[PDB]
Amino acid sequence: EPFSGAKKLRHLLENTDELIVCPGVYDGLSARTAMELGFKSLYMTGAGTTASRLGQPDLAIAQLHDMRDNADMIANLDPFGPPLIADMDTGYGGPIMVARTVEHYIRSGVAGAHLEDQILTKKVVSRDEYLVRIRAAVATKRRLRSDFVLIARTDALQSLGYEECIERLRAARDEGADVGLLEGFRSKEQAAAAVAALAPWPLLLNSVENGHSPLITVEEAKAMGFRIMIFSFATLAPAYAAIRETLVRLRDHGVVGTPDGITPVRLFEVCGLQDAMEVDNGAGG
Amino acid sequence: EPFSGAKKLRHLLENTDELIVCPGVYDGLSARTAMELGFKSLYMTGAGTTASRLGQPDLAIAQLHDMRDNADMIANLDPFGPPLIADMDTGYGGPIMVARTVEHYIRSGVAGAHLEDQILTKKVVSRDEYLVRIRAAVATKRRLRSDFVLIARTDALQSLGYEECIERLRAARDEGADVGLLEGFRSKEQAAAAVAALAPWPLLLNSVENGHSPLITVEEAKAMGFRIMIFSFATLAPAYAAIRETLVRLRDHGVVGTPDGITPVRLFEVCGLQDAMEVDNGAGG
Amino acid sequence: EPFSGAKKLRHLLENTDELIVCPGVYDGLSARTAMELGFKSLYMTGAGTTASRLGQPDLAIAQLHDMRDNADMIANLDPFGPPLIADMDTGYGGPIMVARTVEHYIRSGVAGAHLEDQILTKKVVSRDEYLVRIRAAVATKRRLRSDFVLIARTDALQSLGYEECIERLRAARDEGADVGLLEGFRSKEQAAAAVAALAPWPLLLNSVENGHSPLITVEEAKAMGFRIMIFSFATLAPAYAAIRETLVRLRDHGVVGTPDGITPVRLFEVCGLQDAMEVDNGAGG
């Protein structure tokens, strides 16, 4: 029962027809906030992990250690909480590293992850090179007897086109991927078509706030037939805007000016104070 | 010149009479935002580090590794950037650990840190036990020939009173602390009096947004005579409020709805994209 | 089946009468060597972790992060391998930290750990203060529905005597500890008596190579009735002697001089080369 996110996510995917909405989180505060609000699944972003943990742009700076550490932290805030889908980029190396990444994610209670066809160093590797990554990942999840949900992501739309994306996804499905992710749709028509081309194999829609793809609402994605929808930049973007506006006020007016109900104790409560108090009180000292 | 934050902070303290304003930062995004806005010094919070890196409340959960890792990351985002003052709590153990903490902070380019009299396990240790911590810290900075600014913090006001705080600060000053921090003033009158009681030794004012102490503006603190003013919760609080409001919108309306100018590229730029592009372009491949 | 060390160790303890021999390991090489030789359980030492990962003496320098990272690494080298018992010292703080430590160890596949009565800063805490630690640990293992084996260690012999040790162990057993560890026996007679005083509750014997306690062989400990025997310094000590002798030869003779069969490939094989080759080959690229 505890640390069973993979099993939980797989249940949502196989035993329900609901659109699994996963807000993009990147640290403990953002994750705890999504938990407070009752989201049924969370998504740990690579760009957010990089920006927050390393203060760097999303240019393959975060490696396995950074990603696993952030995912291990987020997925286990509540041992009985919502499953976590995490970006696994290209696996951080050759097949040995892809396998290591999947094993570490599995061990860390991560529910699933997306693995792409980009070069590790928008360019994609050959179809065969991509399948080497998928194969390594699937073999690992099978060897570990895990319900881990492997999402096959293809970034080939821009450079190779729609047909190539569909063929790559079909090939990934044959290799054992559980869900497909065609990144960067140019239109809503194209998004609905990818779903129909791969049906009944489930697809995941990646919504990038203020990105280059069209706006698709949760209701629209559900009607299109997607099974999972992740929200990249959903928390990093508003956090930045708020931090910036507040700091400008401090710089120019000499006061922080945050609404008074956002107290240190409220933040501690969002971050697990009650669980800590129960441990402390239960211990009798 | 690079990694010289301690020297820079010491210059501001000794060669100027300005009030050094340090917004409380807790991750790469918050730190990069403060940098973008031109703050002359930053403050890394313990509560924020704990909430963001660990998703936990501020109950002595973050230890040396967590604190040093976050401080090392923040202080070095720009090798030629603003100095970083970091919370060092009680030093994470006995004198061996206090010394290790100071050494690690120094090695990591941290400019200064505050060390308190709280129990490690509001209660404070004896005056002598506190001085053991200060002594260990000062000896370390001296052995390493560093300009590190050691701030002696006392949390004794609530349980022991004002006089005790003043005597503890005077004792810490004699042991080699560079700045004093009387935590949790109950009034503005009391804040101005502490400054006068320790003059000309410099004091630091810790402003806790939405906390239990009275509101003191930057102009007021400057007139009171404080030399440094740190802003606890200045970025963690508004980040939470914004993340929460956005996620409620996603949950109930199906859209994130973040102002359109907060794009992934703008976030990357705030997080060092230009520096990365210069490295990439300069390398010729 | 994978990551089931706790269940495996508990099976050995409850379903067999064998003396579980656990060599003290401290890094990947020492652990892989014990695995190569077929040991049924391993013991991760605190002194060894500190010396190897931090290059420091055993003076409460390693904290939770260091210990969990080394244990997570060792326990999972083989997902289907031998259980790992790890030192957990005093839990690295108050009950909140004791609980965090147990939870992290459990999550990391650690099979069991020893928790002591020493001060965290040979002195021991009060009986009640020690029971607060045991209580926190037991409650955590129960909340997580884990088979984790909690070993209650008492370091009270020197300062308080034998009777006090026995009463502390009995109290720990009542609080839920699974095994007792009376550290530092002064004689073999005393060791056999502790076993008889706590029978049928199982005891663990800690053999410290070149330490201050008398030499007890595996056969002797088994006859005395101990159920687990750990070997502190079993690998760190000979590694040091060998490294020293080799480096003296390099310094004075200009050659390393290591027996020729200890090749880089043999070391890689000990360290999992075959598993890596199977992943690489299976991936098809």
Add this chain to the structure above:
Amino acid sequence: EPFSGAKKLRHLLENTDELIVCPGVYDGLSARTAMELGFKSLYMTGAGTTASRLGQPDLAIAQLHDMRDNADMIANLDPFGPPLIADMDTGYGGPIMVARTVEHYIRSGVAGAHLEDQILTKKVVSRDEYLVRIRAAVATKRRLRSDFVLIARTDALQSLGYEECIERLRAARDEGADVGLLEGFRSKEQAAAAVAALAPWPLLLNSVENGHSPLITVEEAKAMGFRIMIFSFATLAPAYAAIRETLVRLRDHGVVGTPDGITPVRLFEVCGLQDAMEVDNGAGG
């Protein structure tokens, strides 16, 4: 003066004609032992770091985090100690990562490092691709105003031949590398010739204990004209042999049997006990 390893190594290289002997170390114990014996420079191995910290073979499993953490630990055991040369492999990614690696190594007090032409995923990249790595590294050391010693390593001998190695080294020298390393000489004649072909630019000889290259003594390497000689596997190999023999004795005879003078206190002394005692005693509590 403290944390000045780069300056110290550069002094040995530029102001002396001595052969700088660097034993390969991989953890705190091995490094502390080399320090105890008075070695003037140390070499942190990649294979050893991987085996010890990760328990894995040398197959690009250790990434920047692992390498920097081990190097940061080793180089700073004594702030006034011997310089550390560390393996930096291929820089762990494209130029952005090469630069990040050099910056992190510099910040961590590392004195120098070797950067190679191998593929990151014996094969080498094109000459131009290799120079991109060297360029990124050199630009970083210059931007940081560091004395860091960059060693250009070429693994091209096997697949491309001697001439190609010499041309790659000459090109690397023009880009700013400080020392060259032609890896894997097939004979002593070839080693002396490489030195003469690049004279007066200094070369480093990598001695791999029980490897595939011929045995060259320190006296011989000095006469050949090499300026630095590193000893890969010098400590990992004998540690393994000793750990194995000891564990076989424990398994088959029930006793560890380590010479009695290798006591826990002696190991603590090798690992910095005296420094810790001075901190503890000096603090007055």
